[PDB]
Amino acid sequence: MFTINAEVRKEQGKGASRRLRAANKFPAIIYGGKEAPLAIELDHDKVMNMQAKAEFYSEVLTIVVDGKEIKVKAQDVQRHPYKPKLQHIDFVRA
Amino acid sequence: AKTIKITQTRSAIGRLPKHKATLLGLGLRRIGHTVEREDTPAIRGMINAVSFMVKVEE
Amino acid sequence: DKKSARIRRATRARRKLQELGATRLVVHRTPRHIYAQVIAPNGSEVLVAASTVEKAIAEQLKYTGNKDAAAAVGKAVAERALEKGIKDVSFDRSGFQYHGRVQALADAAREAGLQF
Amino acid sequence: MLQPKRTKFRKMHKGRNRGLAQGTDVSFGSFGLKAVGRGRLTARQIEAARRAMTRAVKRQGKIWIRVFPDKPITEKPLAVRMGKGKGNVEYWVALIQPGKVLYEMDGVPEELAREAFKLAAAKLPIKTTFVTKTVM
Amino acid sequence: KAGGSTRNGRDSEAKRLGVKRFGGESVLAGSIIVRQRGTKFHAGANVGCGRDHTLFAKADGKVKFEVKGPKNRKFISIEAE
RNA sequence: UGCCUGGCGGCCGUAGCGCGGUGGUCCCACCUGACCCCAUGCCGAACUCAGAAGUGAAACGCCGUAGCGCCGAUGGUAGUGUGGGGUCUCCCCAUGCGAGAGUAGGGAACUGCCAGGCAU
RNA sequence: GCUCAACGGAUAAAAGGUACUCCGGGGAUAACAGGCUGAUACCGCCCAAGAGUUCAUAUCGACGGCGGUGUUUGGCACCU
RNA sequence: UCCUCCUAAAGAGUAACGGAGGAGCACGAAGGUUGGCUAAUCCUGGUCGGACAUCAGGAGGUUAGUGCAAUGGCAUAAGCC
RNA sequence: GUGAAGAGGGAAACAACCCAGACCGCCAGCUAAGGUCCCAAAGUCAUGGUUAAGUGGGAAACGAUGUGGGAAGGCCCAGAC
Ligand SMILES: [Mg+2]
Ligand SMILES: [Mg+2]
Ligand SMILES: [Mg+2]
Ligand SMILES: [Mg+2]
Ligand SMILES: [Mg+2]
Ligand SMILES: [Mg+2]
Ligand SMILES: [Mg+2]
Ligand SMILES: [Mg+2]
Ligand SMILES: [Mg+2]
Ligand SMILES: [Mg+2]
Ligand SMILES: [Mg+2]
Ligand SMILES: [Mg+2]
Ligand SMILES: [Mg+2]
Ligand SMILES: [Mg+2]
Ligand SMILES: [Mg+2]
Ligand SMILES: [Mg+2]
Ligand SMILES: [Mg+2]
Ligand SMILES: [Mg+2]
Ligand SMILES: [Mg+2]
Ligand SMILES: [Mg+2]
Ligand SMILES: [Mg+2]
Ligand SMILES: [Mg+2]
Ligand SMILES: [Mg+2]
Ligand SMILES: [Mg+2]
Ligand SMILES: [Mg+2]
Ligand SMILES: [Mg+2]
Ligand SMILES: [Mg+2]
Ligand SMILES: [Mg+2]
Ligand SMILES: [Mg+2]
Ligand SMILES: [Mg+2]
Ligand SMILES: [Mg+2]
Ligand SMILES: [Mg+2]
């Protein structure tokens, strides 16, 4: 089991996403199902440690936003082109 | 009626011809020139285009 | 195959009348029946129509797919067109040869009063 | 030395080498040598780093080469003035963006792949790094 | 060390093709809309095709670009005005 | 008004392929025959004519089916207009625009006019 | 009726030499030298396959890579 | 001198002793019109007959063709009788 | 875009760079870039860090227990190094 803490993005786009990756975070999105897609932001060192396991990309993960658990799976991840960092992760509601 | 103050704060010497025409459309002539214009989207678009060298007072 | 080659054979003069804005008489020919309809220059609605599938025409005939039926059809569609005030059309062979039943239809419509 | 057999055209513009790369993930093998810098790799530099890792593995494992030199490079001869046509094709390069995986390798241990790719990166002008096969 | 040449010195004159009147642009009858080699565009309503596939207006009005047909070809028509 | 079919369009693949099934009162198709109208650089194959014994085998139409084709977000990324900056072959910041590919997902078209048949 | 093709066509009709030379001008343009640059050159360095009885690094150092100098051959034509 | 593409920076245009190719004609039908038709290649079978003539079927669907260079077009064919 | 055909202030000096467009006069004020220890006008200003190289105040591959910060790990008072 992996429990990840997230926050809803107050603003989107290129300048915000660059500025989060400056401030040691990275955006992601939860989508799928009938609910609208949710634009979250994660801590980078936590999720970068959590993703080193294949359990991360196999099991069902719990994302806590506003104390509201969402069981998801890691659908796709955008990585930094030459640094061991994460740009963006897609989470599909399982 | 919904009028704002626009003040040219930088020079227009090396600037683009389109920006010089935008400052002419606002009626700014020299630096520190405070002008009084209505608040339309067309005015806001010229202020957006030359926001680096004007100062809108509203 | 035969249907498609007939459509390819018809779709040049159909597009030409489409840009001419021509009110057009459309013939359709089967071994048993023969069809006619007058189409507005938009190509989306009809004005008059006649066939050998109609009872009022077929009951006066021996066989529905001979030249005498085709002339009776071109006469009926011309008399309906002149009833509705349509006089000048352009004949669409619909990929058939202007020959036989098609020619006897158009000659009947010319003789009854349409002008093409 | 890698070289195209046929070309549609004999010469090519100098171009630029801006942008990020595409061959980012370790596709085929288990370990990879990823480019961090920017530049062009000749066919000699590619074949020398291939020799250094083939010898470092004693032909153990399988080595992929992800890049291929397809850009012709012209030079004018010495004591030739700047006019009178484009220079003669001298050698072939591959344009390298940051993130391009240059080589891949499997069938060997990780430490052996580290020392092989280090012996290869000592033959390359650009700065490289070591990568592994990531799940997703 | 003198020498060389260049078998590749030639080029032809620019034929000034393109679209002369764009969409929503009122034209007179006979006004050239597009000069082009092939039928990159096609002639629609009130638009003639020239000898060199030049699209000219047969009437007066506004130019209308539109995509029709099963092949998604680009047609030029003159709206009334 | 319902069903089915034929003709002419609109639209141009969410509309196309494939696979399975299904249709013959009418219509359509194949069909029968051809001395004639007409036809084959030979051939009634096609074109055409005179027809209606047979069959829905094929074709066509309809239904179903996600193996494809196709469509396709959200977010992010690339790029870039202006202004500014750096370590200036290349990048960054503010701001504005914002892809492509891919993912979730959608999806086995919709609709108009006329005519005919069977029911109502 | 012109390969007036030097193709907006100087005439219907035209090749060369000058170290025996001359005039007007140009650093708008070359040779010398300077300048910029540093391909080349030279001098270093990095990796280390190997040679060195064994032993990569006593001495060498393949395949390739990074610099420095302004020093050769050159490039440009900024001064004269 | 003329044509075509790139350079040419998504209107036009745009230079270099820049990168690549052609023209200095042909046709009294290879033009006009009406009518009709639809390729390349490959597979199988088949007398001489063979990798490859002609013939029949099938896949394919313009990968062909365009009097000639390239580009843009072309099925309503601008292609072929 | 500037110079050419444009002065002034700054970049030590420095046509083309940065700020900015000189009608004239004044022993008046505010500012731009750039600056505030002295040459030489203005902070030896304030708060919190980093550097010990005169780095600043010239340069690469590569090399190194220089030093500051961060996240994680594996041995360990059953006794680690
Ligand atoms: Mg930006
Ligand atoms: Mg069915
Ligand atoms: Mg028959
Ligand atoms: Mg059937
Ligand atoms: Mg988007
Ligand atoms: Mg998209
Ligand atoms: Mg479909
Ligand atoms: Mg279907
Ligand atoms: Mg001449
Ligand atoms: Mg001339
Ligand atoms: Mg003299
Ligand atoms: Mg000079
Ligand atoms: Mg000299
Ligand atoms: Mg050097
Ligand atoms: Mg050298
Ligand atoms: Mg030894
Ligand atoms: Mg040595
Ligand atoms: Mg070396
Ligand atoms: Mg010059
Ligand atoms: Mg001098
Ligand atoms: Mg252009
Ligand atoms: Mg442009
Ligand atoms: Mg011809
Ligand atoms: Mg025809
Ligand atoms: Mg054979
Ligand atoms: Mg000045
Ligand atoms: Mg000064
Ligand atoms: Mg100055
Ligand atoms: Mg200075
Ligand atoms: Mg002051
Ligand atoms: Mg200041
Ligand atoms: Mg002082």
Short mmCIF file of C-alpha atoms (C1' of nucleotides) and ligand atoms in Angstrom, two decimals, chain I residues 36-43, ligand 32:
data_model
loop_
_atom_site.label_atom_id
_atom_site.label_comp_id
_atom_site.label_asym_id
_atom_site.label_seq_id
_atom_site.Cartn_x
_atom_site.Cartn_y
_atom_site.Cartn_z
"C1'" U I 36 27.06 54.56 -3.19
"C1'" C I 37 35.55 52.77 1.05
"C1'" C I 38 39.15 56.53 -1.44
"C1'" C I 39 40.76 58.48 -6.67
"C1'" A I 40 35.21 60.18 -7.74
"C1'" A I 41 28.84 62.43 -6.59
"C1'" A I 42 26.09 58.95 -3.14
"C1'" G I 43 24.99 53.26 2.45
MG MG J 32 32.44 60.48 -1.85
#
